[PDB]
Design a protein around this nucleic acid. Sequence first.
RNA 1: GACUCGGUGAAAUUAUAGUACCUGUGAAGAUGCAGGUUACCCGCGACAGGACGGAAAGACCCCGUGGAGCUUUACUGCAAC
RNA 2: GGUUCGUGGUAGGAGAGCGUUCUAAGGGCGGUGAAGUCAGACCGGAAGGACUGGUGGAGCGCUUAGAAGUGAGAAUGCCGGUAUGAGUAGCGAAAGAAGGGUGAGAAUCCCUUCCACCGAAUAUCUAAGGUUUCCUGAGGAAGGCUCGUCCGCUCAGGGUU
RNA 3: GGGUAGCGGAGAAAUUCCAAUCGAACUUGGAGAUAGCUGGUUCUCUCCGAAAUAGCUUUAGGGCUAGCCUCGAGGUAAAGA
RNA 4: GAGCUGUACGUAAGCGUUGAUCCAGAGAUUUCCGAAUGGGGGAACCCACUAUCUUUAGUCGGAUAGUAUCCUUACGUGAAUACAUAGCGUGAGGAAGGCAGACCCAGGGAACUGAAACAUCUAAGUACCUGGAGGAAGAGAAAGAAAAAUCGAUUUCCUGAGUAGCGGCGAGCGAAACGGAAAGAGCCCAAACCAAGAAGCUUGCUUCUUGGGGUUGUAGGACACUCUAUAUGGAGUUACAAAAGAAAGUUAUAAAUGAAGCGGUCUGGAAAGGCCCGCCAAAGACGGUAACAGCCCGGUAGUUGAAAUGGCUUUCCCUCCAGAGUGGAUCCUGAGUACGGCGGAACACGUGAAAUUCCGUCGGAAUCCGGGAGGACCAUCUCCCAAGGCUAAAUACUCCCUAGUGACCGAUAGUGAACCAGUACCGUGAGGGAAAGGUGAAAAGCACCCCGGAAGGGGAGUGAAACAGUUCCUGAAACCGUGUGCCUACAAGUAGUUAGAGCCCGUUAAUGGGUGAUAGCGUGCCUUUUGUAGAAUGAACCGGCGAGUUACGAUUUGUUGCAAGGUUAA
Lengths: 97, 95
Amino acid sequence: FEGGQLPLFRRIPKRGFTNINRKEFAIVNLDVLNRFEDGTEVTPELLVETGIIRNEKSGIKILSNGNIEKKLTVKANKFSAAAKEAIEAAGGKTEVI
Amino acid sequence: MHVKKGDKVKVITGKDKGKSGKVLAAFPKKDRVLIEGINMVKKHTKPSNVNPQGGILNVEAPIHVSNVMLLDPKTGEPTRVGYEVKGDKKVRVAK
RNA sequence: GACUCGGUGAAAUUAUAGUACCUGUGAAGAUGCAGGUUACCCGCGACAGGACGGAAAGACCCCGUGGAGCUUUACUGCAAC
RNA sequence: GGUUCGUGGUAGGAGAGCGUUCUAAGGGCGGUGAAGUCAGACCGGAAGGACUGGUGGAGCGCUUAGAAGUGAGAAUGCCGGUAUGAGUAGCGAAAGAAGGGUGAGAAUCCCUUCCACCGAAUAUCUAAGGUUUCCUGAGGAAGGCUCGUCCGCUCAGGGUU
RNA sequence: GGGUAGCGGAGAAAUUCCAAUCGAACUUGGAGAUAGCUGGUUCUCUCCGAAAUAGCUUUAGGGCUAGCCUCGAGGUAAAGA
RNA sequence: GAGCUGUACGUAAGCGUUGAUCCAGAGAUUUCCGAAUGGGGGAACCCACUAUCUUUAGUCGGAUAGUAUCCUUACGUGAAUACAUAGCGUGAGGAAGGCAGACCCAGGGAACUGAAACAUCUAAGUACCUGGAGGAAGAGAAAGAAAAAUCGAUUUCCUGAGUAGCGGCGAGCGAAACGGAAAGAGCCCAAACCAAGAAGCUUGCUUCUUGGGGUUGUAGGACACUCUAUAUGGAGUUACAAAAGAAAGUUAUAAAUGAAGCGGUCUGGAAAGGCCCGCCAAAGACGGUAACAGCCCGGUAGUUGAAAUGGCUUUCCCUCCAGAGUGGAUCCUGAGUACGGCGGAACACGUGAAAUUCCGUCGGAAUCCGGGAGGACCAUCUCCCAAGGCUAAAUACUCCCUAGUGACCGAUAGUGAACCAGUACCGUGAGGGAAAGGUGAAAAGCACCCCGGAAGGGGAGUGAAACAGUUCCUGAAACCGUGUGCCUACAAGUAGUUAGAGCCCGUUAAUGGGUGAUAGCGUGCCUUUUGUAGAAUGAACCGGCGAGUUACGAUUUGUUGCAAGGUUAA
Ligand SMILES: [Mg+2]
Ligand SMILES: [Mg+2]
Ligand SMILES: [Mg+2]
Ligand SMILES: [Mg+2]
Ligand SMILES: [Mg+2]
Ligand SMILES: [Mg+2]
Ligand SMILES: [Mg+2]
Ligand SMILES: [Mg+2]
Ligand SMILES: [Mg+2]
Ligand SMILES: [Mg+2]
Ligand SMILES: [Mg+2]
Ligand SMILES: [Mg+2]
Ligand SMILES: [Mg+2]
Ligand SMILES: [Mg+2]
Ligand SMILES: [Mg+2]
Ligand SMILES: [Mg+2]
Ligand SMILES: [Mg+2]
Ligand SMILES: [Mg+2]
Ligand SMILES: [Mg+2]
Ligand SMILES: [Mg+2]
Ligand SMILES: [Mg+2]
Ligand SMILES: [Mg+2]
Ligand SMILES: [Mg+2]
Ligand SMILES: [Mg+2]
Ligand SMILES: [Mg+2]
Ligand SMILES: [Mg+2]
Ligand SMILES: [Mg+2]
Ligand SMILES: [Mg+2]
Ligand SMILES: [Mg+2]
Ligand SMILES: [Mg+2]
Ligand SMILES: [Mg+2]
Ligand SMILES: [Mg+2]
Ligand SMILES: [Mg+2]
Ligand SMILES: [Mg+2]
Ligand SMILES: [Mg+2]
Ligand SMILES: [Mg+2]
Ligand SMILES: [Mg+2]
Ligand SMILES: [Mg+2]
Ligand SMILES: [Mg+2]
Ligand SMILES: [Mg+2]
Ligand SMILES: [Mg+2]
Ligand SMILES: [Mg+2]
Ligand SMILES: [Mg+2]
Ligand SMILES: [Mg+2]
Ligand SMILES: [Mg+2]
Ligand SMILES: [Mg+2]
Ligand SMILES: [Mg+2]
Ligand SMILES: [Mg+2]
Ligand SMILES: [Mg+2]
Ligand SMILES: [Mg+2]
Ligand SMILES: [Mg+2]
Ligand SMILES: [Mg+2]
């Protein structure tokens, strides 16, 4: 309340809408994949057991942030272009389940 | 109550401990007893009442029951009381 | 009726009070502050100038985005027709 | 531990504490006198705390922590007590007097006589309403605007066909 | 002896009366209504210490942001005086 | 198992081991009023009638029983009106009223208030009124939730989430499903059709009653055949049909038994306390007892106990009972219903793009080749099968009962009420509504003397104490007095303070205490104010009571644990 001066929130317009079908992915940066042993097949189920992602909202997306050392086989619902390149640049294969 | 009128009790507490007497009356609603020659009090009595010369009367006042123990004629000592059944009615027993 | 004596015995009010006057000063009108001027201690009958005396959180006046009653071509309604 | 600069203060911010009730644990006091209460010229920078003695007559400190119905001088605060005004206002329309009696005690109760007042009422019935106030015998704390031996008051008995 | 009852009665009309209440009875409840108003708010010491302004406001004795106070922390061509 | 005839401070007359008083179960009695019910009535009263009996010479009296109204239902009478209906009468059943100021469901339904005004909105479907209840109610076995590809009645909790939304898009309002739990349980009809009547006479077709049958979705049933049951088995009074009994066990409602110190000594009125010795403990709970007790008393642990009544659990009795398969000719599967328009409401959802659910009104389907839903609507797909009913548990609340608990109160508190309190008292009434606890261990409650009419005192006595004396533990302050150390009748006083003689004392022993001639200085406290000694406010005084709290969220600082992790809720 501003003692009758029109409050800030009414001086400015409402914006946008909420999407009923909004997908939010559980994010996994490369750095945490170094945790795993070399030549290992990283699944969502393996990513929740280990305790890296607890709730797999809409799916698991792999993002680049950090740098991967080990040569893995990572299967996730989505990969960033950079993440895919980086997983491969190390000497691994990405699959999109 | 562990004693009743007629019982020979020893007094174990008060100005009269060590003294024994007969139980003249029991007041179980007050949990008190009247022992012969125990707890004598001087009652300042007006003539009016049954006592046509009044006067300072010296009589027994009631003691609390928990202040007397029963006397066993065999030993002649203060004893706690047990209850044992002969067959028809139960009876008090010394220990 | 008042007053004196004998009997009985309230109340409003009340920060504590050993509670003068004048001129001044000061929230601008002082028993209470300053400078003076008066004044032995305690009462009783009287009078009301002051204690901005008592009584009543001013009814006047204004204020409150307080009430309430009333009015109408104020607004929105409702009954009834 | 020194040095330097500081230490007026309302609203208000910050800090450290005192004391109250209760709980826990530890350790105590107490009928050779607990708490409370009264008094004192004692101690601490403050809130406060002891000691000694009286009263009191059975419970209470201390330490560390914990929890709060935790601190009053003001609210025309609420309840209680007690002042002040003050031996003051008042004692509610009115005619009494003396003698005798009763009694611990009498202007005030009883009796007598005179006086005075109402008399289309201040008399006699009676409805309402009240509900025992009626009668008798005791009483005199309170009530009665004084007094009181008296009473519509107190206590007993009675009483309405 | 009865009747009319509160968003109502009754009024030879005064806002008059409806149990010492009437521009809308009384009582209980909603109810601790609401009160930008008035009053009040209880132990101690130590350190610091304002404001009574601007802007906007059915706003003007209220409020909000800023200004001015305080506590903590940070950071350096020290930018303050 | 020895006393008893209630409080409470009595007098009297009595009872009791040939078992009283007392405790528990079960009976009997139970005036009048009150729904109040034979009629009336100003509750606790008045007045009857009809039978039967009783009393008297008969009136006059007495006793017992019946006699309200409505609903349902038999039967009988029976009008206008012929049959008949209404009406009237009799007999059965049933209802009526109350309340736990709670919880539940329904009908009806505010305003203050918030929105810094106010009208939509909020408060709130709350308060309140009315009805219905039940021990719980409501809900409930999908015309559901969904769309991880599946789940499988309802309810309640955690979560989702202050999210999605709603909203003068303001103030505010605010889900649900998924996920995790508690608890779990499923059933009966209507209709096809079959049988038996009954009627209408549509006169062999139709609709009405009773019984069988039958209960559901890529369907189920009827209907055809077929296999086994016709109590072999199974199931029950908590739904799934409904009444009955027994017996045994167990719990409740009285009780019983129950270890160990009269230990010594000290203080004391008294010992349970101190000191010194013992002992019991499945018992060191609590209370009482002359101060604080495991061993004094009632008890406590443990172990026993019920004639009678009630509850529960089992078992028996009793009662009741068909359930698989195969086809798909036909038939059935809830109509003034669903739905729609108009007007409202409920849905978190304010008419909105408004699905879903309900009410009024009007219109009004399909009916298995069928119908509904998936948030306007259409198509596809998916999931369901409405217009009938029942259903325990997990949930809510507490007038009560039993046993317990409390960093809850301790007499201005705690209930309004510790006490004869919803009393006294106030009010026409609805209604409002107090104050008021403590002798002592024990009455031992003050014989007797004295003054006084008494009250009240002073002795004497009791008692540990009477300065504990029947309202009597303690006994503060205001306030009222008596006594007297210092001062005071020439003084002008916010009453003190600083200096200070004199006089009087003698301490928590201190560069002490009381008083104060005289001298200097000095306008209370609080509130509110630019500014108050204020001629502004508040307080007569003393005492007690009397105001930032808690819950749930947000945020920030401190602390601690763990740390790319941390943490669980129910
Ligand atoms: Mg006089
Ligand atoms: Mg001037
Ligand atoms: Mg002047
Ligand atoms: Mg002067
Ligand atoms: Mg003055
Ligand atoms: Mg005045
Ligand atoms: Mg005023
Ligand atoms: Mg005014
Ligand atoms: Mg200074
Ligand atoms: Mg300072
Ligand atoms: Mg602070
Ligand atoms: Mg205490
Ligand atoms: Mg005291
Ligand atoms: Mg307080
Ligand atoms: Mg006071
Ligand atoms: Mg005077
Ligand atoms: Mg006079
Ligand atoms: Mg006079
Ligand atoms: Mg007179
Ligand atoms: Mg005349
Ligand atoms: Mg008389
Ligand atoms: Mg008198
Ligand atoms: Mg008399
Ligand atoms: Mg009037
Ligand atoms: Mg309200
Ligand atoms: Mg109020
Ligand atoms: Mg400063
Ligand atoms: Mg504006
Ligand atoms: Mg101001
Ligand atoms: Mg017997
Ligand atoms: Mg009757
Ligand atoms: Mg407002
Ligand atoms: Mg024993
Ligand atoms: Mg001794
Ligand atoms: Mg004692
Ligand atoms: Mg004791
Ligand atoms: Mg509609
Ligand atoms: Mg709505
Ligand atoms: Mg639809
Ligand atoms: Mg319609
Ligand atoms: Mg529909
Ligand atoms: Mg859709
Ligand atoms: Mg939607
Ligand atoms: Mg169907
Ligand atoms: Mg009370
Ligand atoms: Mg007290
Ligand atoms: Mg009270
Ligand atoms: Mg007294
Ligand atoms: Mg002189
Ligand atoms: Mg002179
Ligand atoms: Mg005043
Ligand atoms: Mg916080």
